[PDB]
C-alpha cells in the first residue's frame, strides 16, 4: 500500500485497512443486497429529490474516478425524505465501473454485479459543511444508481463527450448547466442501510439509498469511461477501470426496502 491508495494488486481494497483501520469496521460499504432478506418498511417515506435549481461547476479526474461538482453553498439541489431526517445538499456525483460489462458496481443485488454505479453524494446541512458532516454517523446520504449496458442514456451524453478533456489525474474542465435529473431512473423505489464511504477515509457517516431500478447506458458510453487514466500526464498509462470496492460484511445491519 505505497501509498496514494488505489485499486491495483499492491494498493487495492485489501490493503486499505493499513492506513484506514476502519476498513474492518462495523458499518462498511458497499454490501450485497440480499433481496429476500431485505425487509419492506411501510414506515419509510417517499424519497424527495429536488434538483431543479442544481448548479454544476466543474468536472474533474481525481485519480480514482471522475466527478461533477456542484455549488452547495445554498439549498439548490437537495435530498430529503425517505430514511432521512432533515435536508441533504448535493455536493458531487461520480461513478465506479469495470473493465468488462459484468463487473463495475460496488453494491451487488443477490450477488449480481452491474457494469457501473453512479453515486450522488449529499451532506446533512445541520452540520454546516461536508468536512464536519463526514465526522457524524448521519452526516452524508449517498444516492446509488446501477448502470447496465443496453440503450444509450441521453442525459449522460454531455458527460461522456467531455471526458477526453480530463483524461489524466488532476485535469478538470468547466461543466456548467448540467442537469443531474437526466441520470435518474423512472422509479425511486430503494433499499437503505447505514454504511460508509467506499473509498478512503472509509468514514462511517453514510446513509445509503440504493435505487432498485438501473439506468441503461450504451456500450459506447461506458467505453468512454474506460478510456480515462488513473495516471497523471506523462506517466505510464494505466486505464481507469475496475475502480470499485467489493462487498463488505453486513455484520449487525438490516437493509430496509421502500417497496413491497
Ligand atoms: N463512494 S462514495 O462513498 O459515494 O463517495 C466517496 C467519497 C468521494 N468519492 S470520490 O470523490 O470518488 C473519492 O473521494 C476522495 C476521498 O474521500 C478521493 O481521495 C478520491 O480521489 C476519490 O476519487 C468517493
Ligand atoms: Zn462512490
Curated annotation (Swiss-Prot):
The outcome of changing residue 62 to L is: Reduced activity
Indicate the annotated site residue(s) for Fine-tunes the proton-transfer properties of H-64. Answer: 7, 62, 67
The record's annotation in InterPro entries points to: CA_dom (IPR001148), CA_dom_sf (IPR036398), Carbonic_anhydrase_a-class (IPR023561), Carbonic_anhydrase_a-class_CS (IPR018338)
Q: What is the effect of changing residue 62 to A?
A: Reduced activity
Q: List the disulfide bonds.
A: none
Quick one: effect of changing residue 94 to Y? In OPTB3; partial loss of activity
The entry's stated outcome for residue 62 to V is:
Reduced activity
The terms under GO molecular function for this entry are: arylesterase activity; carbonate dehydratase activity; cyanamide hydratase activity; zinc ion binding
Q: How does activity depend on pH?
A: Optimum pH is 6-8.
Q: Positions modified as N-acetylserine? A: 2
Changing residue 94 to C/D/E/N/Q has the effect of: Strongly reduced CO(2) hydrase and p-nitrophenyl acetate esterase activities, impaired stability of zinc binding
The principal localisation class reads: cytoplasm
Q: What is the effect of changing residue 197 to F?
A: Normal activity
Q: What is its EC number?
A: 4.2.1.1, 4.2.1.69
Record localization: Cytoplasm; Cell membrane
Disease link: Osteopetrosis, autosomal recessive 3: A rare genetic disease characterized by abnormally dense bone, due to defective resorption of immature bone. Osteopetrosis occurs in two forms: a severe autosomal recessive form occurring in utero, infancy, or childhood, and a benign autosomal dominant form occurring in adolescence or adulthood. Recessive osteopetrosis commonly manifests in early infancy with macrocephaly, feeding difficulties, evolving blindness and deafness, bone marrow failure, severe anemia, and hepatosplenomegaly.
What is the protein's quaternary organization? Interacts with SLC4A4. Interaction with SLC4A7 regulates SLC4A7 transporter activity. Interacts with SLC26A6 isoform 4 (via C-terminus cytoplasmic domain).
Q: What does this protein do?
A: Catalyzes the reversible hydration of carbon dioxide. Can also hydrate cyanamide to urea. Stimulates the chloride-bicarbonate exchange activity of SLC26A6. Essential for bone resorption and osteoclast differentiation. Involved in the regulation of fluid secretion into the anterior chamber of the eye. Contributes to intracellular pH regulation in the duodenal upper villous epithelium during proton-coupled peptide absorption.
User: Under which name does UniProt file this protein?
Assistant: Carbonic anhydrase 2
Amino acid at each position: 500500500m505505497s501509498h496514494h491508495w488505489g485499486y491495483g494488486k499492491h494498493n487495492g481494497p485489501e490493503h486499505w485497512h493499513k492506513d484506514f483501520p476502519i476498513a474492518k469496521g462495523e458499518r462498511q460499504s458497499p454490501v450485497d443486497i440480499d433481496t429476500h432478506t431485505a425487509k419492506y418498511d411501510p414506515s419509510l417515506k417517499p424519497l424527495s429529490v429536488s434538483y431543479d435549481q442544481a448548479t454544476s461547476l466543474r468536472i474533474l479526474n481525481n485519480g480514482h474516478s471522475f466527478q461533477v461538482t456542484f455549488d452547495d453553498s445554498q439549498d439548490k439541489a437537495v435530498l430529503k425524505g425517505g430514511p432521512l431526517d432533515g435536508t441533504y445538499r448535493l455536493l458531487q456525483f461520480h461513478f465506479h465501473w469495470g473493465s468488462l460489462d459484468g463487473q463495475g458496481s460496488e453494491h451487488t443485488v443477490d450477488k449480481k454485479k452491474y457494469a457501473a454505479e453512479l453515486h450522488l453524494v449529499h451532506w446533512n446541512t445541520k452540520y454546516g459543511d461536508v468536512g464536519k458532516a463526514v465526522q457524524q454517523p448521519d452526516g452524508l446520504a449517498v444516492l446509488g444508481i446501477f448502470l447496465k449496458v443496453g440503450s444509450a442514456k441521453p442525459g449522460l451524453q454531455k458527460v461522456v463527450d467531455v471526458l477526453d478533456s480530463i483524461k489524466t489525474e488532476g485535469k478538470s474542465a468547466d461543466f456548467t448547466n448540467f442537469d443531474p435529473r437526466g441520470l435518474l431512473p423512472e422509479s425511486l423505489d430503494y433499499w437503505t442501510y447505514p454504511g460508509s464511504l467506499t473509498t478512503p477515509p472509509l468514514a462511517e457517516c453514510v446513509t445509503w439509498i440504493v435505487l432498485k431500478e438501473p439506468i441503461s447506458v450504451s456500450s459506447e458510453q461506458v467505453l468512454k469511461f474506460r478510456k480515462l487514466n488513473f495516471n497523471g500526464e506523462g506517466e505510464p498509462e494505466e486505464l481507469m477501470v475496475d475502480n470499485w470496492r467489493p462487498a463488505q460484511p453486513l455484520k449487525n445491519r438490516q437493509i430496509k426496502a421502500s417497496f413491497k
